[PDB]
Design a protein around this ligand. Structure first.
Ligand code: FAD
Ligand code: FAD
Lengths: 457, 461
């Protein structure tokens, strides 16, 4: 009759089973408990912490519009802090939504154990997945398409809950600044991100609406350019659960149904392709549940993260990542595949840098991504294949516009050579304003010698 | 495992509990059973039937795209038809969504009582109401003000069901034409409604999105304007259940929450007024379920339904109704109140005529509007007040554009007189090109006469 609602990475009021459950069985005490030393090695990066702060404030003022507050707590032990919430609130139950990362797994367990030890009941809900990673079983599911063909033959009839109509409310609590989510010196450079992004669940709704109604129809061809923000841009919102992925899946399947009826074959395959992405976020939770000779050269690492490799697609991507906190999925493949296969940087460096600059930085997806670009996951591009920037150029940036947007020094380079300038003839380079080594970098390593120092093993 | 899904007035594949449940349990056999003889006094009107015919086709091709089909049967006895489906399909259960009109209540009870006897499973579901008429109680209310917020103080939160994944398929069968929903002579006149209206659940969806995203914000003021189609225009879709009132309600409350938190005061006001509309529809079913000289004149009636009364708000209203199958709510008040308090026609004559020309013709909403007009209900229009056309016009058509659009012969009448031309000085009527009795009808009843008869009716209670 008096429940605590533990928010973690489900910062929304719509289709939130935990909050819904608690709101219906009675009064609720919503809380967010930050415990850095317990996240340890999985402490969220700089950009992810900045987004978190924004949408925590967004979610908090939403809850007061409904009649409750958001209590924030920063502490050294999570159960310690939880128990005092029970002390001051006299509640009987604690609810939360499952996360699947290693840290929350041990903790959600350790907090279920210690809590029912004292007669207070705990019940967690699935707030982030169409299918929990233990519900779809066997030959193996070592693939993604075996996995995704299985779920699409299993019903997806799980239903979606409205936001609670009202919330009846009920210390070492603190404010949002007091959580320490930003560092003082990085604050103004962080604020610049608001010019590309407005976190919070109400914005998540607005974004999903315009995407489904206007952009989804073109997803299958827009999503192959890397220029512009050609895909949905939902990933940060999905990571913080500011939008229920069930809502995302169902809105998209409504279109697929209508487009299938009305024999609009392009919209059909658009909806097919886009839902595959949603399934990849699923498989990410699936594999991370069931399957728990480096050049340690910091200068090389610095050239990589600053975009001075001489590889335009790479340099552009790193510039976009630094400026916006986001990059198209194929740019993620290109730059990471560049960090390890071309520069032979240790992957912990590259992954740690994605961790600290990606707004959608997400343990399971980011893991699955690095495992793809290194031939680890059985369905990932083998390591010996070192693909040609020119060919990458023709398929994802066929008019050179991505380069010309992020690397304006190269604006007068003809498209035939804008993705591999070291191969153009010299009169072509002088005709463009391009002096390799002076105003754009020389290829930091030549593609051909990197080709065969990689075949070494 | 093998289930008959009986469609009646729920022509949609989303948030459709009977459809969702059956598909979850196994194979399904959707049917629509048309039996005019059982409908009786309540046979649907010409415009409703035209809409139903479009919608059924829309539904039929949807369910095919999903892997099943919609079978259409026209019969003399519904109970019969259902049994022969069963005998052929060999299924073990039948499901449907509740309806609340007195034909449906008796037919539903009779159908359930006879399938039960033959060992057939039957389950019915709430697919048209936020709350069913037996879930709100104190004894019953009779004032909407207290019914609605007795609702709002309660758990106004119901789950939304996704459309079925896929439908696994399995007589007197016939096509939509052979249902006979149109009369051959009326078909071209009917086909002109596609002018203005696109029936079907997916069109309902498109329209709802457009309303919440771009229109709802302004509804509080737009709902003041009888000209244009300034409200949402969801009513036909709601009446046929092509869109779920639960969906509709949730989308509006979502915006209401955004605007209340962001302290957009204009949008808050629109949202609660719009939900008041949904509450009114809800109240219609609560009232009819729980609560089951004045001289006629065949020629006054014809002048009324043809729009030759000399009351421009009334005549424009009937022009618009006949041309589009729809009219703003306050025009509905004005012409029905005119039918009743000015012409003293039998109130059923007015309801039957709405019943034949409203596309959204709805038994419970229509009963509710005519009863608020005849002041049968407590917070209804007290039988004493008399319309003042000039004030009506000032409020709902403050610039005369409703009249000038539907009654163009009055275009050059100045706004301060366009709603009550019998009051303008002769000189002003001639400056406009307006000759009452020639150009535009004299008021078929003098308003002072109506007032004087009303006043003698009141000094006898
Ligand atoms: C090295 C590498 C690292 C990556 N790190 C992350 C990360 O930290 N956080 C993150 O959310 N995604 C990550 N991805 C996946 C992908 O690049 C992004 O999800 C996508 O670009 C985000 O933009 P979007 O919302 O417009 O994608 P859309 O094409 O519009 O897809 C819609 C949603 O479906 C999911 N999705 C789509 N593609 C994938 C995919 N390949 N893998 C997993 N989920 C997918 C995402 O939640 C995405 O938001 C990584 C990929 C690679 C190769
Ligand atoms: C004499 C009279 C007869 C009427 N006959 C019908 C009818 O046959 N079928 C019908 O659906 N409505 C009827 N109404 C109610 C109202 O006029 C219409 O529902 C409304 O004009 C339809 O257009 P809309 O959807 O754009 O209104 P909106 O303001 O956009 O309302 C949204 C929904 O709320 C419901 N609603 C709104 N207002 C009312 C109301 N006063 N009473 C009941 N429900 C309401 C309707 O389902 C409507 O579709 C009648 C009203 C009167 C006074």
């Amino acid at each position: 009759k008096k429940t605590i609602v533990w928010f973690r990475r489900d910062l929304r009021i719509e289709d939130n089973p935990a909050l819904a459950a608690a709101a219906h069985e009675g009064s609720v005490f919503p809380v967010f408990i930050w415990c850095p030393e317990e996240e340890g090695q999985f402490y969220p990066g700089r950009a992810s912490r900045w987004w978190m702060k924004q949408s925590l404030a967004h979610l908090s003022q939403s809850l007061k519009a409904l009649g409750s507050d958001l209590t924030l707590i920063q502490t050294h032990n999570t159960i310690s802090a939880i128990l005092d919430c029970i002390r001051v609130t006299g509640p009987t139950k604690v609810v939360f939504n499952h996360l699947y990362d290693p840290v929350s797994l041990v903790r959600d367990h350790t907090v279920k154990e210690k809590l029912v030890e004292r007669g207070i009941s705990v019940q967690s809900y699935n707030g982030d997945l169409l299918y929990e990673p233990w519900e779809i079983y066997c030959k193996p599911f070592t693939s993604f398409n075996s996995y995704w063909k299985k779920c699409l033959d299993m019903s997806i009839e799980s239903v979606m809950l409205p936001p609670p109509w009202r919330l009846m409310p009920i210390i070492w609590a603190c404010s949002i600044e007091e959580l320490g989510l930003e560092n003082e010196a990085e604050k103004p450079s962080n604020a610049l991100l608001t010019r590309a992004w407005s976190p919070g669940w109400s914005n998540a709704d607005k974004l999903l609406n315009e995407f489904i109604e206007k952009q989804l129809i073109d997803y299958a061809k827009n999503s192959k350019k890397v220029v512009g923000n050609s895909t949905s841009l939902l990933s940060p919102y999905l990571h913080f659960g500011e939008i229920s992925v069930r809502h995302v899946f169902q809105c998209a399947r409504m279109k697929q149904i209508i487009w299938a009826r009305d024999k609009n074959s392009e919209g059909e395959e658009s909806a097919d392709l886009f839902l595959r992405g949603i399934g990849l976020r699923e498989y990410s939770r699936y594999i991370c549940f069931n399957f728990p000779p480096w050049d340690a050269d910091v200068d090389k690492f610095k050239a990589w993260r600053q975009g001075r490799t001489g590889y335009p697609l790479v340099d552009a991507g790193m510039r976009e990542l630094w400026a916006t906190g986001w990059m198209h999925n194929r740019i993620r493949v290109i730059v990471s595949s560049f960090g390890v296969k071309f520069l032979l940087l240790p992957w912990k460096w590259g992954m740690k840098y994605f961790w600290d600059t990606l707004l959608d930085a997400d343990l399971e997806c980011d893991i699955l991504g690095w495992q793809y670009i290194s031939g680890s996951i059985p369905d990932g591009h083998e390591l010996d294949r070192l693909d040609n920037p020119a060919l990458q150029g023709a398929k994802y940036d066929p008019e050179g516009e991505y380069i010309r947007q992020w690397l304006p020094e190269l604006a007068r380079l003809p498209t035939e050579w804008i993705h591999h300038p070291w191969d153009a003839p010299l009169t072509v380079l002088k005709a463009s304003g391009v002096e390799l080594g002076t105003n754009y970098a020389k290829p930091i390593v030549d593609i051909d010698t990197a080709r065969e120092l990689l075949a070494k093993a």
